Ligand SMILES: *[C@@H]1O[C@H](CO)[C@@H](O[C@@H]2O[C@H](CO)[C@@H](O)[C@H](O)[C@H]2NC(C)=O)[C@H](O)[C@H]1NC(C)=O
Ligand SMILES: *[C@@H]1O[C@H](CO)[C@@H](O[C@@H]2O[C@H](CO)[C@@H](O)[C@H](O)[C@H]2NC(C)=O)[C@H](O)[C@H]1NC(C)=O
Ligand SMILES: *[C@@H]1O[C@H](CO)[C@@H](O[C@@H]2O[C@H](CO)[C@@H](O)[C@H](O)[C@H]2NC(C)=O)[C@H](O)[C@H]1NC(C)=O
Ligand SMILES: *[C@@H]1O[C@H](CO)[C@@H](O[C@@H]2O[C@H](CO)[C@@H](O)[C@H](O)[C@H]2NC(C)=O)[C@H](O)[C@H]1NC(C)=O
Ligand SMILES: *[C@@H]1O[C@H](CO)[C@@H](O[C@@H]2O[C@H](CO)[C@@H](O)[C@H](O)[C@H]2NC(C)=O)[C@H](O)[C@H]1NC(C)=O
Ligand SMILES: *[C@@H]1O[C@H](CO)[C@@H](O[C@@H]2O[C@H](CO)[C@@H](O)[C@H](O)[C@H]2NC(C)=O)[C@H](O)[C@H]1NC(C)=O
């Protein structure tokens with residue numbers, strides 16, 4: 001997983017408020033990365049159990 | 050289908066001439082979305098239109114016993130769905146956005162599924178390899194007992210018990226129904242990805258505002274073109290993200306419809322010896338039912354019981 | 360498909376053509392491959408009347424690998440995909456049980472080959 | 479037929495069905511709605527004292 | 528093109544039957560789009576529906592057959608388009624006549640509606656599903672084949688693409 005905010009700004013409030021002007025890009029990115037981390041456990045449940 | 054120009058600019062005219070400067074970015078996106086929409090009809094044609102004729106069950110409707118009434122069509126309905134297909138269907142304009150209708154109604158899909166069912170109940174597996182050849186249902190059941198390595202008097206001497214067990218197992222399915230999360234997930238992910246594209250239109254992406262009239266309404270052209278280009282850049286990035294994810298999500302739906310077509314061929318139009326391809330146990334036969342945007346397979350298998358040691 | 364239709368005979372339905380798979384031949388194409396599938400398709404069907412078993416001497420007889428059919432007055436055994444009728448004997452049937460538990464049994468004679476020939 | 483030939487960039491179209499353009503009703507006049515009017519400046523006392 | 532004391536928009540206005548609370552000006556949908564307003568002067572609620580847009584498709588039998596054409600206005604009500612005007616679940620079709628026969632599909636329109644150049648021009652009318660076969664099933668009847676045919680078919684598959 002990557003925290004989208006800490007990658008781009010990294011503990012800086014000046015950058016964080018400017019990042020809010022792009023909307024839901026980081027929410028989208030975290031949602032995409034989490035869905036493929038959930039798929040990996042399903043992958044090995046389907047082979048071994 | 051999204052109109053790239055109407056999502057980006059949207060009415061305004063200062064925005065269309067500025068967006069004309071980006072080349073064929075919007076033509077590519079419309080081609081990408083149109084290919085996806087043409088693939089969705091071929092998915093359904095490949096799963097369901099697997100039959101030459103539209104077969105009908107005979108009126109008497111007596112398979113020496115076995116009772117198929119919960120999965121045969123219901124004549125007292127406009128849709129003519131079955132009882133289990135009715136249970137399954139009760140459980141599942143904007144800024145350039147449009148939804149096209151499927152080529153096949155789901156009346157047509159229910160009519161394909163009932164014909165696949167009447168082919169199986171009346172001819173076994175012969176209609177999947179040529180002309181349908183009728184055979185009595187008890188004798189077809191006895192052919193299938195041979196296919197799993199049981200001798201066929203075991204069927205004829207236990208016909209009533211075997212028919213009662215089938216009937217009780219079919220009865221338990223409605224209770225277990227009245228599950229479909231795999232069909233809800235697709236609808237949910239698509240609606241949620243379409244809601245984000247619309248919500249991305251109220252963001253300034255680093256301009257003064259996010260509404261293409263107030264930006265200009267309070268400034269000259271030389272000074273407004275700068276902000277309108279930022280708005281354009283953000284709104285084009287959002288649409289590319291949307292289309293790329295729809296492309297990745299449609300290739301996953303295609304791999305699933307391909308698995309469904311193989312199951313309809315190999316578990317409904319024949320008897321399978323592949324282990325676990327058509328349920329747990331020794332595959333006897335399978336019945337299809339149509340769901341919204343999907344298919345349900347009822348697999349009948351043989352499970353051994355009450356062993357002794359020797 | 361090259362493994363399962365060209366180097367073998369497949370039993371999967373509609374995987375190597377439409378019909379009953381006999382054999383397959385590959386041909387190369389510009390960026391792909393063409394398979395020529397050779398299949399068997401049955402034709403020109405007739406109806407007969409059937410029974411599941413035959414009762415004789417109080418026993419129930421089942422066909423070893425066929426179907427019992429009747430041309431109107433006589434009872435034969437065929438193989439299931441091609442019509443080729445044979446006299447019902449104790450060489451192409453087997454016995455299990457008495458003839459009051461199967462539903463649909465018919466009465467007919469099952470011919471023993473030794474019984475006459477010996478005598 | 480000519481709009482189809484232009485959409486395909488060809489002089490021979492084969493049988494099929496082709497999406498060629500779009501139909502968008504047109505809107506006329508601009509109705510600007512608003513609220514009534516608040517108190518009117520008491521200019522009649524400064525001018526008429 | 529309307530302006531309600533600040534709310535700028537476009538669309539068709541229609542008499543409503545919702546009831547705001549007597550301090551609310553306009554209503555919003557899920558996904559946050561204005562869909563109702565209240566008229567300041569008369570204080571009545573009016574719904575705001577968008578106008579009418581949609582794709583246009585051209586149905587042709589092929590220029591090597593004819594130069595006649597039919598036109599589909601997609602999911603547009605066929606009374607607001609600007610002979611044969613025919614309303615479909617897929618839009619308004621102009622230039623094809625609707626017949627009552629039915630057998631197969633030629634050019635797919637949608638929602639079980641097809642077109643062909645037959646009776647020619649362009650026509651609309653589903654495409655059916657297939658013939659109709661009636662198995663003479665009974666509790667003691669069987670059909671057995673007496674002959675066969677050897678058939679051979681093709682199957683084409685892509686294996687590679689160009690390396691760039
Ligand atoms: C097939 O099974 C159904 C049950 O799912 C039978 O219909 C029910 O029959 C019982 C009595 O046997 C009634 O009490 C129910 O009201 C029936 N349900 C209906 C009609 O929806 C049906 O009779 C069976 N078919 C045959 C030929 O026996
Ligand atoms: C067949 O016999 C075996 C024993 O040979 C049974 O397994 C026994 O089960 C008991 C009770 O669970 C255990 O304590 C024994 O250890 C088992 N025997 C062995 C050798 O492990 C088995 O249950 C019997 N099965 C049937 C159908 O009779
Ligand atoms: C098998 O026998 C059935 C029973 O007659 C035949 O099916 C009927 O054929 C006639 C004439 O084609 C139709 O009018 C009937 O509607 C059919 N169905 C019935 C009577 O239920 C069928 O033709 C025979 N099959 C073969 C191969 O000879
Ligand atoms: C059913 O088939 C049998 C063939 O075994 C027919 O009976 C024979 O018919 C031939 C020619 O008509 C005669 O020479 C034989 O004497 C008949 N009997 C036997 C025991 O061979 C019978 O006619 C057929 N029935 C129908 C309705 O076609
Ligand atoms: C098949 O053969 C058996 C024995 O030849 C028949 O059984 C006889 O049937 C008659 C008439 O119902 C009775 O009077 C006898 O008592 C029965 N004998 C025995 C030993 O059961 C049987 O009926 C025949 N089946 C048919 C359909 O004719
Ligand atoms: C300034 O005051 C005078 C007098 O107070 C107003 O004169 C009135 O005019 C109206 C209309 O002409 C008459 O009906 C009244 O009778 C007049 N008043 C008197 C006392 O005669 C005059 O209208 C005022 N100015 C303005 C701009 O309203």
Ligand SMILES: *[C@@H]1O[C@H](CO)[C@@H](O[C@@H]2O[C@H](CO)[C@@H](O)[C@H](O)[C@H]2NC(C)=O)[C@H](O)[C@H]1NC(C)=O
Nearest residue numbers: 512513514515516549565566567568569570571
């Ligand atoms: C805004 O002003 C208009 C008139 O300018 C008001 O309209 C009146 O509405 C009442 C209904 O209670 C009618 O009886 C009157 O005849 C209307 N007057 C006219 C001239 O048409 C309107 O009500 C005002 N707005 C509000 C919120 O009260």
Ligand SMILES: *[C@@H]1O[C@H](CO)[C@@H](O[C@@H]2O[C@H](CO)[C@@H](O)[C@H](O)[C@H]2NC(C)=O)[C@H](O)[C@H]1NC(C)=O
Nearest residue numbers: 400401402403404442672673674675676677678
């Ligand atoms: C089985 O079908 C074949 C056709 O596939 C029949 O052979 C044909 O017979 C006709 C008439 O005698 C000839 O005109 C054709 O030339 C034959 N075809 C071929 C490929 O040789 C054959 O007679 C049928 N067999 C039976 C028993 O009906």
Ligand SMILES: *[C@@H]1O[C@H](CO)[C@@H](O)[C@H](O)[C@H]1NC(C)=O
Nearest residue numbers: 112113462463464665666667
């Ligand atoms: C078949 O149905 C008939 C009704 O026409 C009945 O008389 C007969 O007993 C049935 N036989 C079997 C084997 O089901």
Ligand SMILES: *[C@@H]1O[C@H](CO)[C@@H](O)[C@H](O)[C@H]1NC(C)=O
Nearest residue numbers: 492493588589590591592593
């Ligand atoms: C196309 O035109 C050629 C020659 O004009 C003709 O031979 C052919 O049949 C035509 N094709 C169709 C589908 O009409």
Ligand SMILES: *[C@@H]1O[C@H](CO)[C@@H](O)[C@H](O)[C@H]1NC(C)=O
Nearest residue numbers: 603604605606607614615616
């Ligand atoms: C088109 O508008 C008319 C007028 O209200 C209406 O009767 C008709 O039903 C509309 N079209 C459809 C497809 O509903």
Ligand SMILES: *[C@@H]1O[C@H](CO)[C@@H](O)[C@H](O)[C@H]1NC(C)=O
Nearest residue numbers: 613624625626627628629652
């Ligand atoms: C088609 O059949 C229906 C039957 O209800 C009839 O009302 C209609 O007029 C027919 N259409 C034509 C074009 O004849």
